[PDB]
Structures are given as structure tokens and as C-alpha cells.
Design a protein around this ligand. Structure first.
Ligand SMILES: CC(C)(COP(=O)(O)OP(=O)(O)OC[C@H]1O[C@@H](n2cnc3c(N)ncnc32)[C@H](O)[C@@H]1OP(=O)(O)O)[C@@H](O)C(=O)NCCC(=O)NCCS
Lengths: 326, 295
């Protein structure tokens, strides 16, 4: 489950991290009032959607007045924002954040963490190369990605955060501030069942302040039953409507771009079913897990339209063949 | 066979529940030794003509069980898993879907100094056909034989079982390690067991999108597995950034894709099929074994 920027910043601020503070505006008047409340010369208005690349899509704007804030909020609220991380229809903008200007930033750092499947440990990644595609840095210059594996018994220790801070070229009070930032992030990660987080950029201001400017928090949806306040952050408007409809009947639907539908028991068999269609010239419309091919085997689940257990089919190959031939 | 056989004594955690009841009845019909179960608050009762206990400590003291299968809802799995790891039981199978990743991170680290194996969660379990089934897999599609199977899926595993049953090869032991990001038993752990099992003469390795487990398994096989391995990877067609049902089935940042798992098999000398219908056929081609059910 994704959080909005404003939600991720409120959460990290509650763990003692310094964030680019802002105010959520659900209409243009609240936005104008927000610009005045911050009391800065400049603010940054950001469309609150679950997808990065908002800046290049026109969803991030510097403003210098209450009326200008009202105007930008006017142009954004109620129009779907299409970014490189949405599809062609984009995500609904029901609010903007009005944020303090952190200009001037000296340096953009990267800090994130995931559950690393290979080591089976919470693992932080940090880099001097912030504010860019961290995947491209990792590919071109892997020596610039610092990793810290966290031992679950002792958790993240200050020395581990200090090792990273010195390697990032941080100095004086910045070391202590980064240690507090990374230790807070770890506490949040465990206490909130994060699946991942990213602070990109983790900005260093002219005066040495360490500030979370943007990034992402994804929560483990398996754990939301024990975080009622986080489950209450859910924004169903950012989800695919067809995916959302299906999930409310505890059905797993993923839409593709093809012209064959399929109904399957098991995620592995659903992918294999799709793949054996595309193997037989077909283009799958969808993954679905309880022209259409129905394909049921049965373990816990007890047993034009092709049916492999109306055109009937005898094996996997038969069904893939028959259903593309339709 | 590995880990389970006709001597295995099985306890059921959540024995009195819907799935605990159904699958225990199927296991008993298959000849699996279900010695009883644990449901807190139902101690001292009878279910399926077997004793029910309040605690795994009571259940092990009474039955000498050496295996347990968990049919408890996801919020109670960490507690149920630590309870059985502490009890003296050597083998734990977790069927449950929806266990938090960070609960399995803790349970997996807890195992490091223990004489206990955990299979799952979010898995169909383990079966030694003709001797013992622990989990939800249909017994009748299996047949005692010579193919070991390791899979991150349920029903997709059943395709590989049906294919090897229909060719007359049969299965030694089949292990569904499950679809979650941190399983209690990974591919390499299972490959070592099958490598050292004389009944296993060839191995099927079934994977999908997510992680680097198949790439790592390929690097292990190249230097530590002498038996023929046939690979199959589901999810060539999955979009990136999308959970494909399984918590562990997701392509994140150009990693966890299918064609690079196929490329790691090639580099390790591991035969594979791109067709889920042709796992048995590829195994027959690689081994040159007879299909005794053709004539
Ligand atoms: C685990 C699962 C099967 C349970 O579903 P269920 O059988 O319908 O659940 P029920 O509530 O009927 O039974 C659960 C039982 O566990 C018991 N239980 C709860 N905590 C327990 C504990 N710590 N120890 C033991 N038993 C416990 C409950 O008391 C209940 O028994 P009761 O009904 O007699 O009180 C379900 O949550 C699930 O994960 N299903 C999907 C499984 C799946 O598809 N896996 C992938 C296979 S490839």
C-alpha cells in the first residue's frame, strides 16, 4: 500500500525525521490559506498522487502568493495527472500539498531501505548521487551505493549510520543529524511494517540541515490488520478501479493489453496460463486468480469460452491452442 | 525421499478449523499419521477421533510428534511458529497466506541455531508420494517415483506432478516452498536435500518473477548438484511493479524478471522449458528415460 507524500512526511516527522513541511489543501481556498500559514516568500505546490515524476508532468509548481497558490491548486485539483509511473489515464488529484521552499540545497543524497530477499535482512542503501534514477547510479557506479544490513536482534546501531555518514562526506553536526534520521527510519520501518521506503532527495541545505524532500513509503499490506491508523490512510482513488473492484471480492485481477481473458486458481498457474497463450500467439487481457480460457487444477481450491478442468480442452497446451484459434 | 515418510507423526495447529479439518481428513485417507492437534481452548477434546491439546508442549509430550502443519490465520502465525519451534518438533509446514514479511524475517533468524526446518508460508506443503502428505496438495495426482520437485507455487507444481505421473516417472518428494519474500526453506536448502536423496534421480525447479532466488539456485547447482535439473519460470508476461497474487511475485526495478532467470539457467548448464505443458517432456528428453505409459 502506497502513502501520499503528505502522509509519508507526517509519519517520518513523528519518528523525529526533518521533512519539507507542508499543508494539505482539498480546495484552492485551503491552498491559498496554506501559503499564508507557512509564512515563506516561496512555497512549492505538489499534486498529491501515488506516483513519482510529478515535476516533469506539471504537478509541482513554485508559487510566491496566496492568489498564485489558489490558481495552481485550481489547475491541478480534479484533473488526472499522467506521469511516467502511471498509465495513460493517470491518477486523480483530490488535493495538493503546499510545502515550504528548502532552496538553496547544496547536495541531494539518496537513502532507502527494503527487506533484502537474498540476505533475509532489512537493508539500507545510501548514496551521494541523490535526486536522480538510483537504478542508473547502481548500474553505472555500484561503488557509490552504500549498503547496511541490519541484524534483527540488535537493530540499526549508531556506528552503522556513522560509517555511512562519513562515506557520504557529511561533516560536523550533519553526522549526528544523519544518525538520528537513519535510526528513526529503522524504528518506523519495523513499527509500521514498511515494505520499502526511499528519501530521494535527502537534501543538504546551505546551512547543513538534512531534510526529506521527496520519496516513497510502501507498507506491507499483509500487516495492515495490526496498524489501524495506517490502514485508515488508504486512498482507494489512486488504485486501478478494476483491480479494486475485484479485490473487494478477494479476487486478484491485474489488467494487461491483450484480447484473451483467463480465470485460474493460483498466481503461478495464472502466469503460466498467460505465458502458454502468448506462446501460442495469444495476447493476455489479464491475470486472474480465484475470448476467455478457464483453467482450474485444485489444491486448497476443490474442483467464446475454452474450459480446461463452450469449447472443452484436455491439457494445458490444448487449451492455449484452442483459445488463440478462437 | 526427504524429511517426511510413512513413520512421520504429524500434529495440526488449527486442527479444529475449517481447513485444518478438511485437509487432516484427506491426509488420514492418504495414510498420513495425523496424531492430533492444537487449538487453544479446545484441549482435552476429540476431533476426527484424535486428541486435541491446548499447547504444542502438551501435544508433543502426549504424541512424540515430529512434524506439524499450521492452518492458523495470518495474525497468529508468528506465535504458532515460535510455539512449534520451541516444542521439539523437527519439521513445520505453514500453509497460511498473508503472513507479514517482517514476522517471517524474525522466524527465519530464530531458526538459525535450532534443529528445525520450516516450509512456507503461503505454500501447499511437502509430500512423499505413497508415504506421507503434509499440506493441501491432492494425493491422487502423485505417484511414488524418482523425480524431486521444488516450486514457489501450488497449482503450477500440480502440473509438473501430473506430467511426471503421466510419463510413469513419479515423484520422490515434492516441496512447495511458497510464494512469500522470506520463506522458511529456500531453493538451495531444498536442492541440497534432493541432491543427497538416493530415491531422487532428477529435479524439477519451478520459479516465477520476484527475487534472485532462481539465479542464486542456478549458481549453487552449477557447483553442488550432480543430478539433472529441469527449470521452468512462470510470468514472462507479467507487467513490472505489480504483485501477481503472491507477495513474492513482483518485478521491482528491472530485477526479478523471467528471461534473466532463463539466462542464469543457460550459464549454469541447467536445461529448461519455456512451456508449462513441456516440463515432463523436457525432463524425458534430458534423461532419455522411457515413457512406460506410452505403449
Ligand atoms: C490458514 C487458513 C487456511 C485458515 O483458514 P480457515 O481454515 O478457514 O480458518 P478457521 O478460522 O476455520 O480455522 C483457524 C483455526 O485456527 C485456530 N487458531 C488460532 N490461533 C491458533 C494458534 N495460535 N494455534 C493453533 N490454532 C490456532 C482458530 O482457533 C481456528 O480454529 P477454531 O475455528 O476451531 O477456533 C487461511 O487463513 C489461509 O491462509 N488460507 C489460504 C491458504 C493458501 O491458499 N495458501 C497457499 C497454498 S499454495
Amino acid at each position: 500500500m502506497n502513502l501520499h507524500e503528505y502522509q509519508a512526511k507526517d509519519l517520518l516527522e513523528s519518528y523525529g525525521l526533518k521533512v519539507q513541511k507542508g499543508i494539505v489543501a482539498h480546495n484552492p481556498n485551503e491552498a491559498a490559506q496554506a501559503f499564508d500559514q507557512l509564512g515563506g516568500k516561496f512555497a512549492v505546490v505538489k499534486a498529491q498522487v501515488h506516483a513519482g515524476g510529478r515535476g516533469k508532468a506539471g504537478g509541482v509548481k513554485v508559487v510566491k502568493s496566496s492568489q498564485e497558490t489558489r490558481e495552481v491548486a485550481e489547475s491541478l485539483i480534479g484533473k488526472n495527472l499522467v506521469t511516467f509511473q502511471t498509465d495513460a489515464e493517470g491518477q486523480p488529484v483530490n488535493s495538493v500539498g503546499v510545502f515550504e521552499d528548502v532552496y538553496p540545497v547544496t547536495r541531494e543524497l539518496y537513502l532507502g531501505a527494503v527487506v533484502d530477499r537474498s540476505s533475509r535482512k532489512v537493508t539500507f542503501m545510501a548514496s551521494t548521487e541523490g535526486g536522480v534514477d538510483i537504478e542508473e547510479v547502481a548500474h553505472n557506479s555500484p561503488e557509490k551505493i552504500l549498503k547496511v544490513e541490519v541484524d534483527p536482534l540488535v537493530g540499526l546501531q549508531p556506528f552503522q549510520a556513522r560509517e555511512v555518514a562519513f562515506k557520504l562526506g557529511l561533516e560536523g553536526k550533519q553526522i549526528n543529524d544523519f544518525v538520528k534520521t537513519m535510526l528513526g527510519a529503522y524504528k518506523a520501518f519495523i513499527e509500521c511494517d514498511f515494505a520499502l521506503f526511499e528519501i530521494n532527495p535527502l537534501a543538504v541545505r546551505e546551512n547543513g540541515e538534512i531534510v526529506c524532500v521527496d520519496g516513497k513509503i510502501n507498507l506491507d499490506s499483509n500487516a495492515l490488520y495490526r496498524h489501524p491508523k495506517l490502514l485508515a490512510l488508504r486512498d482507494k482513488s489512486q488504485e486501478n478501479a478494476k483491480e479494486l473492484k475485484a479485490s473487494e471480492h478477494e479476487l486478484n485481477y491485474v489488467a494487461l493489453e491483450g484480447n484473451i481473458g483467463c480465470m485460474v486458481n493460483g498466481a503461478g498457474l495464472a502466469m503460466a496460463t498467460m505465458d502458454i497463450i502468448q506462446l501460442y500467439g495469444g495476447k493476455p487481457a489479464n491475470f486472474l486468480d480465484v475470448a476467455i480460457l478457464i483453467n482450474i487444477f485444485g489444491g486448497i481450491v476443490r474442483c467464446p469460452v475454452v474450459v480446461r478442468l463452450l469449447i472443452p480442452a484436455d491439457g494445458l497446451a490444448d487449451a492455449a491452442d484452442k483459445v488463440v484459434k478462437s | 525421499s526427504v524429511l517426511v515418510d510413512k513413520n512421520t507423526k504429524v500434529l495440526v495447529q488449527g486442527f479444529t478449523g475449517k481447513n485444518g479439518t478438511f485437509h487432516s481428513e484427506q491426509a488420514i485417507a492418504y495414510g498420513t499419521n495425523i496424531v492430533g492437534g492444537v487449538t487453544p481452548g479446545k484441549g482435552g477434546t476429540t476431533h476426527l477421533d484424535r486428541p486435541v491439546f491446548n499447547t504444542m508442549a502438551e501435544a508433543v509430550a502426549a504424541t512424540g510428534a515430529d512434524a506439524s502443519v499450521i492452518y492458523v490465520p495470518a495474525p497468529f502465525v508468528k506465535d504458532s511458529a515460535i510455539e512449534v519451534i520451541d516444542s521439539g518438533v523437527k519439521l513445520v509446514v505453514i500453509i497460511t497466506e498473508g503472513v507479514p514479511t517482517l514476522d517471517m524475517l524474525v522466524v527465519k533468524e530464530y531458526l538459525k541455531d535450532k534443529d528445525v526446518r520450516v516450509i512456507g508460508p503461503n505454500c501447499p506443503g511437502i509430500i512423499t508420494p505413497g508415504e506421507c502428505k503434509i499440506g493441501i496438495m491432492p494425493g491422487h495426482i502423485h505417484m511414488k517415483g524418482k523425480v524431486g520437485i521444488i516450486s514457489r507455487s501450488g497449482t503450477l507444481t500440480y502440473e509438473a506432478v501430473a506430467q511426471t505421473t503421466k510419463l510413469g516417472f513419479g515423484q520422490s518428494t515434492c516441496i512447495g516452498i511458497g510464494g512469500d519474500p522470506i520463506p522458511g526453506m529456500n531453493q538451495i536448502e531444498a536442492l541440497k536435500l534432493l541432491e543427497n536423496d538416493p530415491q531422487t534421480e532428477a529435479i524439477i525447479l519451478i520459479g516465477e518473477i520476484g527475487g534472485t532466488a532462481e539465479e542464486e539456485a542456478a549458481e549453487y547447482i552449477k557447483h553442488n548438484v550432480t543430478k539433472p535439473v529441469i527449470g521452468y519460470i512462470a510470468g514472462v508476461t507479467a507487467p513490472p511493479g505489480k504483485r501477481m497474487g503472491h507477495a513474492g511475485a513482483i518485478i521491482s526495478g528491472g530485477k526479478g524478471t523471467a528471461e534473466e532467470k532463463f539466462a542464469a539457467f543457460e550459464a549454469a548448464g541447467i536445461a529448461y522449458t519455456r512451456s508449462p505443458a513441456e516440463i515432463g517432456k523436457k525432463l524425458k528428453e534430458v534423461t532419455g528415460w522411457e515413457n512406460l505409459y506410452f505403449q
